[PDB]
Design an enzyme around this catalytic site. Structure first.
Site, PDB file in Angstrom:
ATOM      1  N   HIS A  17      29.985  69.177 101.475  1.00 31.68           N
ATOM      2  CA  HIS A  17      31.412  69.307 101.942  1.00 31.68           C
ATOM      3  C   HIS A  17      32.890  70.117 101.831  1.00 31.68           C
ATOM      4  O   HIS A  17      33.479  69.844 101.807  1.00 31.68           O
ATOM      5  CB  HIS A  17      31.822  68.304 100.434  1.00 31.68           C
ATOM      6  CG  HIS A  17      31.211  67.299 100.562  1.00 31.68           C
ATOM      7  ND1 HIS A  17      31.469  66.478  98.989  1.00 31.68           N
ATOM      8  CD2 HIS A  17      29.874  66.902 100.811  1.00 31.68           C
ATOM      9  CE1 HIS A  17      30.334  64.894  99.689  1.00 31.68           C
ATOM     10  NE2 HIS A  17      29.485  65.594 100.136  1.00 31.68           N
ATOM     11  N   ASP A 113      38.024  64.912  96.933  1.00 28.57           N
ATOM     12  CA  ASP A 113      36.656  64.404  97.960  1.00 28.57           C
ATOM     13  C   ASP A 113      36.438  63.253  97.661  1.00 28.57           C
ATOM     14  O   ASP A 113      37.249  62.414  96.659  1.00 28.57           O
ATOM     15  CB  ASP A 113      35.897  65.137  97.735  1.00 28.57           C
ATOM     16  CG  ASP A 113      35.084  65.637  98.672  1.00 28.57           C
ATOM     17  OD1 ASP A 113      34.725  65.022  99.914  1.00 28.57           O
ATOM     18  OD2 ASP A 113      33.924  66.590  98.860  1.00 28.57           O
TER      19      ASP A 113
END
Ligand code: LV5
Length: 452
Positions: A17, A113
């Protein structure tokens, strides 16, 4: 020269990520400064530190004080642990934002996120624009936004469904191929997944690492304005660059090996970090490559029960036809090589996009997270790959491995699969050009952060 507004990024998972998040921030420089507010449950890994410390200076990193996850179940899924990590780091994130604001800097946006929606509450209290970065497919994003309705209409386990799930704008997916956290609705992972999905509407916008040329259906459905649904900004494909302009060094041996092989003739096999196979599953793959005439470049990792853990005389059967690499390989430099003709991957969205960007057809071998949904969308939706069928014992037998490899490198479906994959390659470079659809998406998101 006006002061650059500041932006706080809150990542969820590991290196998978940080990469797309970093590329997203790197493409908005130097209009903004960034700070990775990274939650931790322990000493940050040397991989995370070395990567984040290599970003441009405008992208700072702040490892929040670690939190205690010992009270969570020892068998807790990763989605549960990540959600607790953000929740128990909000006071730290509050102080980190408080230090930048106290200095007169304008914190223009909080980018959370996909599993950090609980951090949106902090942004809302402090008048900061909350945005969500989705480092996965527009299909899976549609699944998140539809998960609330899918829960109110289906009561049983998803794998018990006879018909496939119909997500708005996407292709049908069988319940068994839905993302991992929904495969057990009694687990805290599913309750957390539902928790976040309901909170996406709190963001002024969702930034999804995809584009219309790659997911026409889902993207057009996401861009459909609805109340209670946030605006979506397709900015994909966001991938790192190769060693083309990232430092000067000597040519790795594996790349020299590819130079001597023919064009589009080597099959690159790599499941990525955390993509470990069982000793039996690895043996099946090793047996097909041993007895195949296909050229392969295989990144091997120790099984969970490494080039010495391979079958007897495996390196003898595959000397100049194949090349085994331990643990790591320069994935992007391999995919960009002309001699790479196929990519056997776990369908991690970063690896998938790096393969689409260089026009390399795939062997979709999903493992965890949303990779099975990515495999369905690639093989049956875009028709740019082949998926070997898993057995009832979770093992993918050599018959399937050899079948997909054969149909891909040779055969006429592998001829159509390659031509189709080239269309996406040209489309990928298109959306990233000065006339690109994704170049606009970034520009519009930046203007919003600068608005008012
Ligand atoms: N762990 C994880 C990472 C990414 C996604 Cl898209 C999902 Cl569903 C789970």
């Amino acid at each position: 020269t006006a002061p650059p507004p500041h932006v706080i990024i809150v990542p969820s998972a590991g290196m998978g990520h940080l990469i797309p998040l970093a590329e997203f921030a790197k493409r908005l420089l130097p209009r903004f400064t960034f700070t990775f507010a990274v939650p931790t449950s322990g000493p940050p890994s040397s991989s995370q530190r070395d990567f984040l410390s290599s970003l441009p200076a405008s992208i700072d990193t702040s490892f929040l004080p670690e939190v205690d996850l010992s009270d969570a179940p020892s068998d807790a899924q990763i989605e549960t642990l990540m959600s607790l990590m953000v929740v128990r780091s909000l006071p730290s994130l509050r102080d980190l934002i408080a230090s930048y604001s106290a200095s007169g800097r304008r914190v223009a946006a909080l980018v959370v996120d996909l599993f950090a929606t609980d951090a949106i509450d902090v942004a809302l209290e402090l008048g900061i624009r909350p945005f969500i970065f989705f480092p996965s497919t527009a299909m899976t994003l549609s699944f998140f936004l539809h998960l609330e309705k899918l829960d109110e209409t289906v009561s049983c386990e998803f794998a018990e469904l006879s018909d496939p799930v119909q997500i708005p704008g996407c292709i049908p997916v069988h319940g068994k191929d839905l993302i991992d956290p929904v495969q057990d609705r009694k687990n805290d992972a599913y309750k957390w997944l539902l928790h976040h999905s309901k909170r996406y509407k709190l963001a002024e916008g969702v930034i999804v690492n995809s584009f219309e040329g790659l997911e026409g259906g889902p993207i057009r459905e996401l861009l459909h304005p609805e109340p209670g649904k946030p605006r979506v900004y397709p900015v994909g494909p966001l991938i790192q660059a190769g060693s083309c302009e990232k430092g000067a060094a000597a040519r790795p041996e594996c790349l020299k090996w590819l130079d001597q092989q023919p064009r589009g003739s080597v099959l690159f096999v790599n499941f990525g970090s955390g993509g470990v196979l069982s000793t039996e599953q690895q043996n099946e793959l090793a047996g097909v490559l041993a007895h195949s005439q296909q050229r392969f470049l295989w990144v091997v990792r120790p099984p969970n029960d490494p080039l010495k853990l391979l079958p007897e005389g495996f390196l003898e059967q595959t000397a100049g036809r194949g090349l085994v690499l331990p643990m790591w390989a320069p994935q992007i430099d391999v995919l960009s090589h002309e001699s790479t003709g196929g990519f056997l991957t776990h369908c991690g969205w970063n690896s998938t996009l790096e393969s689409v960007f260089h026009g390399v057809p795939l062997i979709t071998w999903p493992l965890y997270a949303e990779q099975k949904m990515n495999a369905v969308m690639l093989t049956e939706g875009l028709r740019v790959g082949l998926r070997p069928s898993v057995g009832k014992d979770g093992i993918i037998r050599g018959a399937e491995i050899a079948r997909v490899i054969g149909e891909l490198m040779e055969g006429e479906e592998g001829k159509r699969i390659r031509s189709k994959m080239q269309e996406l390659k040209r489309a990928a470079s298109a959306v990233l050009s000065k006339d690109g659809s994704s170049t606009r998406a970034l520009e519009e998101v930046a203007k919003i952060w600068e608005s008012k």
